[PDB]
């Protein structure tokens, strides 16, 4: 299942409600093509990996999340688990989400 974070309040709550499954966040931009261009993958994994939690963040309308995460390049994939960070990587690499997810799965 996916989860949209419109405020830092929903950010921490997303990790808390995420249970203990892996959690990948997509810091993209709905107005930016190159960022949303990777949605047919990250968001698609929602059906191929129903055992993984996927989040979404608007680096422009939710600058509070990007601010605390100091994001300077989109899309930025960040991995969280039980509210703790384990790894992260930016750069359009949808195939990497698979290898990274299967890594900390």
């Amino acid at each position: 299942m996916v989860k949209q974070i419109e405020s830092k309040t929903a950010f921490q709550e997303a990790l808390d409600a995420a249970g203990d499954k892996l959690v990948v966040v997509d810091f993209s931009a709905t107005w930016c093509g190159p960022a949303k261009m990777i949605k047919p993958f990250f968001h698609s994994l929602s059906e191929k990996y129903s055992n993984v939690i996927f989040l979404e963040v608007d680096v422009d309308d939710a600058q509070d999340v990007a601010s605390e995460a100091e994001v300077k390049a989109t899309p930025t994939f960040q991995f969280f688990k039980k509210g703790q960070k384990v790894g992260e990587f930016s750069g359009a690499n949808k195939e990497k989400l698979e290898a990274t997810i299967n890594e900390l799965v």
Partner: peptide, 13 residues
């Protein structure tokens, strides 16, 4: 509007 920094999606290389 909603603009911030560069989107290095399939734009980088």
């Amino acid at each position: 509007f909603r603009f911030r920094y560069v989107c290095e999606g399939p734009s980088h290389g």
